[PDB]
């Protein structure tokens, strides 16, 4: 495998997002770290699929609604940046106001 | 009891070359990875991590070639049959060829130490369009030091079947005591080639000249079989290599280049 | 497209060109196979192997480096030997020389 | 007053006559002796014995032990007793009853203000394991072995290089110095093995003066008789151990030639079990010589169904034989036979084999030396039953014999038995505290030179140390200067004379190796047997006194799947 | 004897005339020369050449190399050869045929007792990459870059502070000393860049005497002509490199004023590609001056569909422009055009751009310097085809040109080319061993100063090093004193004269920087082009010799998704 | 099969054998329970406890070590005392002796 | 739990294989690390089930086919070694040419 | 996310419990670490849901029965302590004899 440290960090993010999505499926209201992890992993999986950075920026704002997260969480997340390996290398995806 | 070893190989065509589809093994018989020195021929080496075969060991090798597959099966060293304590070693090789399949079963010689109670059974199942090019060489004793296989039991059985029909049944059975079949020749060699013609028979007879009158090649039902007895270990292997190099282009349409495991 | 694949032009590589060369016949009188490496001093091999050891003094196996030839018990193998190079001084093995081969 | 023996065992651990089963095995140890006085045991926590004026005396720091392990069940080659352990200045000060001599009858371990208490009630305290065949491929081994209960590692290597992947040789004074400097960062006692496959004595002398405590002769560097003779001569001159991994190619001769080249000089032979090689199975006969110390790597311990199937790829990767190269598989004929593998376990049981090494990350697992040793002990107990010289319905003798295979015998082999190896006065306080349910698998604490080096810690933010997730973490015994003060670096006598320690600025404490050249097979503890062992190269029928040696492969093993997540 | 060339390539790696494809790219390198003798190659493992009296000589430790990389495929700016590499005392001793001179024909690398063997058969050995634009935001970068194959990092910063987030400046002697002390804990050669945005020469002289090897002029601290002139004068006096990140606001003048302020003095200019800024696209013309050394950050390398879309937020975060503040987005007009981004790749191909830096964690990725350089090379090979001066059907010239961009040219720029930069005799043994299938992505080993620093290790408890999970771990070359002895800290001449090393107790070895003020565009290796480049500020039509320069964005890139998990 | 299980042979363990022994009656006059450990010098216990403290000088509770007996408020408990051993010097507690018990 | 460091490494491999199997379920073509992690975790789970080393060696070659992984990945994975805790202790499983 | 080290430790526990629950779904008998991880993660998820500490103590004894774990495991686990973030802060949940 030859996992680089960045890949280990991304694995940690993936585990956090697994926790977040299981809690979301349970019907809970996600807090700040759960929402951040869920949106970041959504962006990472979309990039692995092959979507463009602009498309992922547009799509990342419709993963979590205001009623799916705890009160005050949307204001604690002005934007989410995440590095993802698109078919054309590693790129930065910034999602502005991901929860609306 | 006995240390049971079993290997089952299934080959099939994939990506324009023969690949080892399945290698299911239990006990001390292993196949690591096929080699491709040529374009599509699958060169395979059967590993026997235990050096010799002690009394009571039971080896069972089975091979199945899919249609249109060309493979070259070899062992990376001779098979030693140590002196037995009373239990006999059973080596059972069963090889099946689909139509158009080509197989080159080229094992190393089996060296039987004095007092080695062993029993070998190699059978080939072929279709009408299958192609086979194999040999089986036995060294009875250790001729260089003087041992001449005074005692022990040997049973070398070789069979060929074409479309469920016994075409050749070669049996070499040695009882405890003196050996009359070998006639002071501890090197018993057999060569098989299923698609053969009279020109190939003449060429083989030409190649058997340095081995003397003890080498005989007969073509029956298209199958060319060469039986010989020798006592030098240098003329024998040279003749086997020469016959294989002569038959390779006429059977598989390939260069007679030797497998790299034979160390040139 | 195979990552990190080789494109080796066809041909042959001649090994140990321009060196003294010989042929010997080795008989393994032991009960187990003996493996001899390429650069081993062939005059100092296992005493079970029997051959003209005077002729093989200062010679090694003429095989590709890193390979080893195997002598099965009770066999007789004809092998190709190539002379040593450099200072032609051998140390180690059985310690039968422990110095220069000539003078 | 009087209480039920069950209540006493619950409160203070088993006393004399009680039997404790080792972790999910069939081995039942029995407390042979108790060094305490009933009703005067020292216990800590809340309103208990160890308090000001009750269990803690008024003596000064110089008159009391620095650390005390209370109510420990000491299992060691010298016996299985129940006693307290007093450690002073990082070394074992005393073994016996602890407490306050002012108000307690027979106190040999005075507890004072300067005393830190470790509660070992209902726990087994053993000496730190010693690993004498270690490939220094990665530093992460040092922690891993430390988790497994091994505190001293003797071996060579320079990292994941081709030479280290196959041999435990640290080649050259430069790499020896670099490895010695790097050893200061590892929380284990470390000894270095040089490269002995040289026919020029001066190079070996330079390597020994660089700081190695032993010379390693390996086939991959050439185990020719000349190299063996030169290395043995150098070791005799400089008093270092010689480890031999004899050539499996029979290139320079058979095993008889190698034994003749040894010439009756002390040598520590690896792979003596004949787990594949040209010298197998005859190399097993080498266990019958007084000067040969036979070791055995763990992967073939014990005999299991899966043992043979995994050997070929392990050997090919270890010896740099690429399966993708056609000429390489010519070496795949390792001549490994199940008869020798089955005989190795029985030879360990009889005491013919004195050591159980690891050969870490090169045909061997660093963290499964103790575990596989106890698995072999359990298998031999199951198959062969109780030993002939067992007293009572317990496995005390077998436990003592097997615990000596990785604690004291490796220490005697490499001449470090005066510092580590066993729980004795003056030894380095290298202790491992196990819970009996986890004995040999997962320690409750690893004390390294008087300080806790590694321990299972739970959540750091937790209000107590117990809550999940509990995993092993390095404690203050593995931090900078504290690690340097609580660990040893072994050097040859020439290295100590040359002042290697101050030239390299070795921050850790320095211990000098002595006694390597005089240890014989008789000097091994509980493993001094030199059987009249015969083996037939044709039938592989290993015999001692004309009796067959065999073992059936294990289908299920203790301490394997009940404890490990994966 | 004779063997097939395929068998020889399998056993020893490609020989002369064989072509090797770099990792999943379209670049085919060809072995130009072979420095060995056929049939006398040294190989390790089992019964092979490197053994006592066969490949390993009898010479002493002072007459043999400490380490030998065997059968390496050396790719470097001076050629693509097949040879062994001998390293002695942590430095490259020789390049050529290794073995035992006693029985081998032409040996220039004597293998002896003191020699450790690294098997590089079928592997590519390159010089450690050099990163001359590094923001020291976190120490975890040092490992990450080391995983990527970069061994030397030149840059500034004090941690995740506002100044470091934007500029590579270590402000003041106090922070310079603290960063120098912290550098001892990182397993990479480290050079420090001071803050040059000062109109008072005394502060710059104090910073240089503190220990920085160069001065950084950045817009965020004010890239006014007065500051540039003062920093250049100080550097001329004190022989240090000056790195310029010109102001993008046109506050004090246009690019012509900045060039006039430079006044023909040597300067290392970042962002010369014009990837956004007021000086773009005119700053690209700066690549035509002899005294300008043009660099380029990796994020705009190569031109891809996704390159532009990610630039705005990256720039705003890097330059501390909060999107939540209305007045901040007035700076969001970065004036970034796809024409200049497309032209930057072609300028790299033509050799107009000499360096490929990172600008780590501030508009740039630390671990993707080599990777993105080879991606650019692949894109230029795909689009522009073979170069004009290519000999044979290989990419050897292009490979040399692109490997000089991050190995030797950065070394010459910052005056450290006498110690690191390329695989040459006397250089520091900073080597990266790649498998050809993973070239430029994941090294098989990173040798730092003659010792393995970081390597892919599998399970520690495994019987061999290969089993999963395999991930990169720091080896003994990154442990305490071993790390200190196997790494370099670069200082200015004034710092060495002032005795900064002993005042701060710098445990690592000290190298003194020289030759910064004399390097010109011609001194760059394979990147000495000074084209008659013209650009129109209205049409953004970059032209050289009147010919249009353009590139098409890459939809899919090699070495991107085949290797990385996420 | 219980991992790490004990097999304790049945019987009793006699504690503090061959030591001077006494019996006392203690009344807790406080409003809260008082717990006294095994090795506490019983003559220097909480003054709320009322008994003949002259008889209890140099004695501790004759209970298994590490255990404590509890006196509830308004109760009357008969307890067994065992004499100290060793040097018979007591330091600490209320500091009422601070030295050897005899001479 | 008393997780030894080797158990933590195996947990990291398990997380990577979770990523790989989710991507495989999505219908993507796995790359080198994903394929290696998936095959290694298959072997480890089979060992935990109780299969033999030889059976796992045979079975590990039929987890991923050539069309389920990116081009060139099968040639980048000549073999996969993995340590797994069989009922009879820890053993090494080597799968040769796991993708065909 | 700003993951504190305790959150990383809890993520490791979550991964171990994922392994444990997958193996339980396969029908195997869990060992000591698997049982501990499964029960600890059950308690953590119950706390995240909003249950009280006493209710979680009651409910943690009915997650694994004696027939679902290997022989000797229930006696190897006298109790399980775990820290969990209830709506009223971090609290310690102790489950006594979790397997009966």
State the method.
cryo-EM
Q: Mark E245-255 as b/e (b = at least 16 C-beta within 10 Å).
A: bbbbeeebbeb
Residue D400 in marked binding region? no
- Which residues have C-beta within 8 Å of that of residue E325, sequence separation ≥ 6? none
Across-strand partners of G89?
G86
Rounded-to-integer distance, Cα E566 and Cα A6, Å: 9
Residue D359 in marked binding region? yes
Q: How far is CA B187 from CA B119, B192, B227, B261, in A?
A: 17, 17, 11, 22
Q: Mark D7-42 as b/e (b = at least 16 C-beta within 10 Å).
A: ebbebbbbbebbbbbbbbbebbbbbbebbbbbbbbb
Are E314 and A92 a contacting pair at CB < 8 A? yes
CA dihedral (D399, D404, D407, D410) positive or negative: negative
| Domains of chain E, first to last | 5-126 (2.30.40.10), 127-417+521-548 (3.20.20.140)
Are D159 and E10 a contacting pair at CB < 8 A? no
Rounded-to-integer distance, Cα B203 and Cα D195, Å: 58
Residue E484 in marked binding region? no
Across-strand partners of E117?
E68
| Chain E (374-433) residues lying within 8 Å, Cβ to Cβ, of chain A | 375
Cα D553-G48-G34 angle, rounded to 5 deg: 125
| Partner residue opposite E116 with nearest CB, options D175, D198, D324 | D175
Give the number of beta-carbon pairs within 8 Å between A and H. Answer: 28
Rounded-to-integer distance, Cα D346 and Cα D368, Å: 19
User: In 3-state terms, what secondary structure has residue E373?
Assistant: helix
Using CA coordinates, name the residue in chain G closest to D379. Answer: G88
Rounded-to-integer distance, Cα E225 and Cα H51, Å: 66
Please, is B70 exposed, middle or buried when counting C-beta atoms within 10 Å of its C-beta (0-12, 13-18, 19+)? buried
CA dihedral (D49, D55, D61, D62) positive or negative: negative
Are G49 and H26 a contacting pair at CB < 8 A? yes
Residue owning tokens 């912290």: E182
Rounded-to-integer distance, Cα E379 and Cα H5, Å: 42
Q: How far is CA D338 from CA B27, B55, B85, D540, E140, in A?
A: 10, 13, 17, 9, 49
| Residues of E tagged active-site | 319
Strand ranges, E, within B98-239: 102-106, 110-112, 118-126, 131-140, 154-162, 166-174, 187-193, 216-220, 223-230
Are E554 and E304 a contacting pair, CB within 8 Å? yes
Are C69 and B263 a contacting pair at CB < 8 A? yes
Q: Is D319 a catalytic residue?
A: yes
G54/chain B closest Cα distance in angstroms: 6
Across-strand partners of D130?
D152
Question: Resolution of the deposited coordinates, in angstroms?
Answer: 2.7
H20/chain F closest Cα distance in angstroms: 21
Report yes or no: H89 at the F interface, CB cutoff 8 Å. Answer: no
Q: Mark F32-67 as b/e (b = at least 16 C-beta within 10 Å).
A: eebebbbbbbbbbbeeebebeeeebbbbbbbbbbbb
Interface of H with G (CB under 8 A): 12-13, 15-16, 18-19, 23, 26, 28, 32-33, 36-37
Q: Quick one: CA torsion of E313, E319, E322, E325, rounded to 10 degrees?
A: -120
| Partner residue opposite C64 with nearest CB, options E6, E11, E562 | E11
Are D332 and B49 a contacting pair at CB < 8 A? yes
H82/chain F closest Cα distance in angstroms: 24
Are C75 and B233 a contacting pair at CB < 8 A? yes
CA dihedral (E463, E467, E469, E470) positive or negative: positive
Cα E331-E361-E304 angle, rounded to 5 deg: 75
Greatest alpha-carbon span in chain G:
41
Pick among B6, B8, B18, B33 to test the G interface (most G CBs inside 10 A): B33
Residue E348 in marked binding region? no
Among E411, E413, E442, E410, which Cα is nearest to E428's?
A: E411
H51/chain G closest Cα distance in angstroms: 24
Q: Quick one: CA torsion of D459, D460, D464, D467, rounded to 10 degrees?
A: 0
- Classify strands D430-434 and D443-448 as parallel, antiparallel or unpaired: antiparallel
CB atoms within 10 A of CB E201: 14
- Which residues have C-beta within 8 Å of that of residue E169, sequence separation ≥ 6? E156, E157, E163, E193, E194, E195, E196, E197, E216, E218, E221
Are E279 and E245 a contacting pair, CB within 8 Å? no
One-letter-per-residue 3-state SS of E31-68: CCEECCCCCCCCCCCCCCCCCECCCECCCCHHHCCCEE
Are B233 and C33 a contacting pair at CB < 8 A? no
Residue B229 CA from chain centroid, whole number: 16
> What is the DSSP-derived secondary structure letter of residue D223?
-
Rounded-to-integer distance, Cα D313 and Cα D323, Å: 9
Rounded-to-integer distance, Cα B217 and Cα B223, Å: 10
Q: Mark F68-83 as b/e (b = at least 16 C-beta within 10 Å).
A: ebebeeeeeeebebbb
Chain G environment of D140 (Cβ under 8 Å): 5
Please, is E424 exposed, middle or buried when counting C-beta atoms within 10 Å of its C-beta (0-12, 13-18, 19+)? middle
- Are chains C and A touching, using the cut-off of 8 Å on CB pairs and a minimum of 3 such pairs? no
Among B246, B249, B192, which Cα is nearest to B217's?
A: B192
Among H69, H49, H71, H67, which Cα is nearest to H59's?
A: H49
* Tally: H helices and E strands in chain E: 15, 27
Rounded-to-integer distance, Cα B96 and Cα E459, Å: 41
Give the number of beta-carbon pairs within 8 Å between E and G. Answer: 63
Pick among C46, C74, C90, C98 to test the D interface (most D CBs inside 10 A): C46
Report yes or no: H71 at the F interface, CB cutoff 8 Å. Answer: yes
Rounded-to-integer distance, Cα D454 and Cα D8, Å: 30
Among D247, D222, D271, which Cα is nearest to E113's?
A: D222
Are F68 and D47 a contacting pair at CB < 8 A? yes
* Tally: H helices and E strands in chain G: 4, 2
Chain C environment of D330 (Cβ under 8 Å): 35, 67-68, 70
Report domain extents, chain G: 5-96
Tokens of D25: 């095995």
Please, is B171 exposed, middle or buried when counting C-beta atoms within 10 Å of its C-beta (0-12, 13-18, 19+)? exposed
| Partner residue opposite C40 with nearest CB, options E41, E43, E54 | E54
Chain A environment of E324 (Cβ under 8 Å): 78
Residue D165 in marked binding region? no
- Which residues have C-beta within 8 Å of that of residue B180, sequence separation ≥ 6? none
CA dihedral (E127, E30, C66, E445) positive or negative: positive
Report yes or no: A75 at the E interface, CB cutoff 8 Å. Answer: no
Please, is B254 exposed, middle or buried when counting C-beta atoms within 10 Å of its C-beta (0-12, 13-18, 19+)? middle
Report yes or no: E556 at the G interface, CB cutoff 8 Å. Answer: no
- Which residues have C-beta within 8 Å of that of residue B89, sequence separation ≥ 6? B53, B54, B55, B56, B57, B58, B59, B81, B116, B117, B118, B119
Rounded-to-integer distance, Cα D157 and Cα D135, Å: 6
Residue owning tokens 């920026």: A57
Report yes or no: F3 at the H interface, CB cutoff 8 Å. Answer: yes
User: In 3-state terms, what secondary structure has residue E133?
Assistant: strand
Cα E46-E51-E53 angle, rounded to 5 deg: 150
Element (H or E) spanning D189, and its range?
strand D189-195
> What is the DSSP-derived secondary structure letter of residue D56?
B
Report domain extents, chain C: 1-103
Q: Is the peptide bond before D281 cis (omega within 30 degrees of 0)?
A: yes
Rounded-to-integer distance, Cα D548 and Cα D541, Å: 7
Give the number of beta-carbon pairs within 8 Å between D and H. Answer: 63
Helix H segments across D172-286?
172-183, 201-210, 225-238, 255-262
Rounded-to-integer distance, Cα E556 and Cα E223, Å: 38
Rounded-to-integer distance, Cα E535 and Cα E555, Å: 27
Among D164, D162, D539, D519, which Cα is nearest to D354's?
A: D519
Q: Could you say which architecture CATH assigns to the domain G5-96? A: 2-Layer Sandwich (3.30)
Are G52 and D564 a contacting pair at CB < 8 A? no
Are A92 and E298 a contacting pair, CB within 8 Å? no
Element (H or E) spanning G21, and its range?
helix G5-26
Using CA coordinates, name the residue in chain C closest to E124. Answer: C4
- Which residues have C-beta within 8 Å of that of residue F61, sequence separation ≥ 6? F36, F37, F38, F39, F40, F42, F69, F79, F80, F81, F82
Among D213, D169, D192, which Cα is nearest to D514's?
A: D213
Tokens of H17: 């419990």
Q: Which of D268, D311, D319, D526 is catalytic?
A: D319
Are B139 and C78 a contacting pair at CB < 8 A? no
Residue E311 in marked binding region? no
Residue E395 in marked binding region? no
């Amino acid at each position: 495998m030859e996992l680089t440290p960045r890949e280990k960090d991304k694995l940690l993010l993936f585990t956090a997002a697994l926790v977040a999505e299981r809690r979301l499926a349970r019907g809970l209201k996600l807090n700040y770290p759960e929402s951040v992890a869920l949106i970041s992993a959504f962006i990472m999986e979309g990039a692995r699929d092959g979507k463009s950075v602009a498309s992922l920026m547009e799509e990342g704002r419709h993963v979590l609604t205001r009623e799916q997260v705890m009160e005050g969480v949307p204001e604690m997340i002005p934007d989410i940046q995440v590095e993802a390996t698109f078919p054309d290398g590693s790129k930065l995806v910034t999602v502005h106001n991901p929860i609306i | 009891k006995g240390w049971q070893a079993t290997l089952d190989l299934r080959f099939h065509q994939a990506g324009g070359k023969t690949v080892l589809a399945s290698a299911q093994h239990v006990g001390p018989l292993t196949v690591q990875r096929p080699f491709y020195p040529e374009e599509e021929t699958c060169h395979l080496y059967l590993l026997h991590p235990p050096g010799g075969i002690v009394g009571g060991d039971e080896l069972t090798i089975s091979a199945q070639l899919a249609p249109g597959c060309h493979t070259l099966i070899t062992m990376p060293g001779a098979s030693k049959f140590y002196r037995s304590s009373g239990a006999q070693a059973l080596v059972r090789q069963q090889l099946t060829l689909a139509p158009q399949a080509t197989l080159e079963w080229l094992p190393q010689d089996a060296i039987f130490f004095p007092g080695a109670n062993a029993r070998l059974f190699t059978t080939f199942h072929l279709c009408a369009s299958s192609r086979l090019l194999a040999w089986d060489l036995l060294c009875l004793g250790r001729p260089v030091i003087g041992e001449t296989f005074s005692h022990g039991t040997l049973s070398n059985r070789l069979e060929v079947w074409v479309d469920d029909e016994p075409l050749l049944v070669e049996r070499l059975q040695l009882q405890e005591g003196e050996l009359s079949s070998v006639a002071e020749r501890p090197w018993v060699g057999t060569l098989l080639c299923y698609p053969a013609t009279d020109a190939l028979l003449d060429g083989v007879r030409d190649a058997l000249a340095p081995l003397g009158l003890y080498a005989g090649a007969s073509l029956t039902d298209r199958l060319l079989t060469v039986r010989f007895l020798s006592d030098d270990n240098l003329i024998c292997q040279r003749v086997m290599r020469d016959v294989w190099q002569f038959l390779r282009p006429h059977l598989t349409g390939k260069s007679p280049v030797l497998p790299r495991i034979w160390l040139t | 497209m195979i990552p990190g694949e080789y494109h080796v032009k066809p041909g042959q590589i001649a090994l140990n060109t321009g060196r003294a060369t010989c042929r010997v016949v080795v008989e393994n009188h032991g009960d187990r196979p003996i493996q001899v490496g390429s650069h081993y001093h062939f005059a100092e091999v296992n005493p079970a192997l029997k051959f003209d050891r005077q002729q093989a003094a200062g010679y090694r196996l003429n095989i590709p480096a890193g390979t080893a030839v195997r002598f099965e018990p009770g066999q007789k193998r004809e092998v190709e030997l190539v002379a040593f190079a450099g200072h032609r001084a051998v140390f180690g093995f059985r310690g039968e020389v422990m110095g220069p081969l000539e003078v | 007053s009087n209480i039920s023996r069950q209540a006493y065992a619950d409160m203070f651990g088993p006393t004399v006559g009680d039997k404790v089963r080792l972790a999910d095995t069939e081995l039942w140890i029995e407390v042979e002796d108790d060094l305490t006085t009933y009703g005067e045991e020292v216990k800590f926590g809340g309103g208990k014995v160890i308090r000001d004026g009750m269990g803690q005396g008024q003596m000064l720091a110089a008159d009391c032990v620095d650390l005390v392990l209370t109510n420990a069940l000491i299992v060691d080659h010298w016996g299985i007793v129940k006693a307290d352990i007093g450690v002073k200045d990082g070394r074992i000060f005393a073994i016996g009853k602890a407490g306050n001599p002012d108000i307690q009858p027979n106190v040999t371990i005075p507890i004072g203000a300067a005393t830190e208490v470790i509660a070992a009630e209902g726990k087994i305290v053993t000496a730190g394991g010693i690993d004498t065949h270690i490939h220094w491929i990665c530093p992460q081994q040092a922690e891993e072995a430390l988790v497994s209960g091994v505190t001293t590692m003797v071996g060579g290597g320079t990292g994941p290089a081709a030479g280290t992947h196959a041999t435990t040789c640290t080649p050259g004074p430069w790499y020896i110095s670099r490895m010695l400097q790097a050893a200061d960062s590892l929380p284990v006692n470390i000894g270095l093995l040089g490269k002995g496959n040289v026919s020029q004595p001066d190079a070996l002398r330079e390597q020994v003066a660089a700081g190695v405590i032993g010379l390693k002769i390996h086939e991959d560097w050439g185990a020719t008789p000349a190299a063996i003779d030169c290395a043995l001569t150098v070791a005799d001159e400089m008093d270092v151990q010689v480890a031999l991994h004899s050539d499996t190619l029979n290139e320079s001769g058979f095993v008889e030639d190698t034994l003749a080249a040894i010439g009756g000089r002390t040598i520590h032979t690896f792979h003596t079990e004949g787990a594949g090689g040209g010298h197998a199975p005859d190399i097993i006969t080498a266990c019958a010589h007084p000067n040969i110390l036979p070791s055995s790597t763990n992967p073939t311990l014990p005999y299991t169904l899966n043992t043979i199937d995994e050997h070929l790829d392990m050997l090919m990767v270890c010896h740099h034989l690429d399966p993708d190269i056609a000429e390489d598989v010519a070496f795949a004929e390792s001549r490994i036979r199940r008869e020798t593998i089955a005989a190795e376990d029985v030879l360990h049981d009889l005491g013919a084999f004195s050591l159980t090494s690891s050969d870490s990350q090169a045909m061997g697992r660093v963290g499964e030396v103790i575990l596989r040793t106890w698995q072999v002990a359990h298998r031999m107990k199951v198959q062969r039953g109780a030993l002939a010289e067992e007293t009572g319905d317990n496995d005390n003798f077998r436990v003592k014999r097997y615990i000596a295979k990785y604690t004291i015998n490796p220490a005697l082999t490499h001449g470090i038995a005066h510092e580590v190896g066993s729980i004795e006065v003056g030894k380095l306080a290298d202790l491992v505290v196990w819970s009996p349910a986890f004995f040999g698998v997962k320690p409750a604490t690893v004390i390294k030179g008087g300080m806790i080096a590694i321990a299972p810690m739970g959540d750091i933010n937790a209000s107590i140390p117990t809550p999940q997730p509990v995993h092993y973490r390095p404690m203050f015994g593995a931090l900078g200067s504290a690690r340097h003060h609580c660990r040893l670096t072994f050097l040859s006598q020439a290295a100590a004379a040359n002042g290697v320690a101050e030239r390299l600025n070795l921050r850790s404490a320095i211990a000098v190796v002595k006694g390597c050249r005089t240890v014989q097979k008789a000097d091994m503890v509980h493993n001094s047997l030199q059987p009249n062992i015969t083996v037939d190269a044709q039938t592989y029928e290993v015999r001692v006194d004309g009796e067959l040696i065999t073992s059936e492969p294990a289908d299920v093993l203790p301490m394997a799947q009940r404890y490990f997540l994966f």
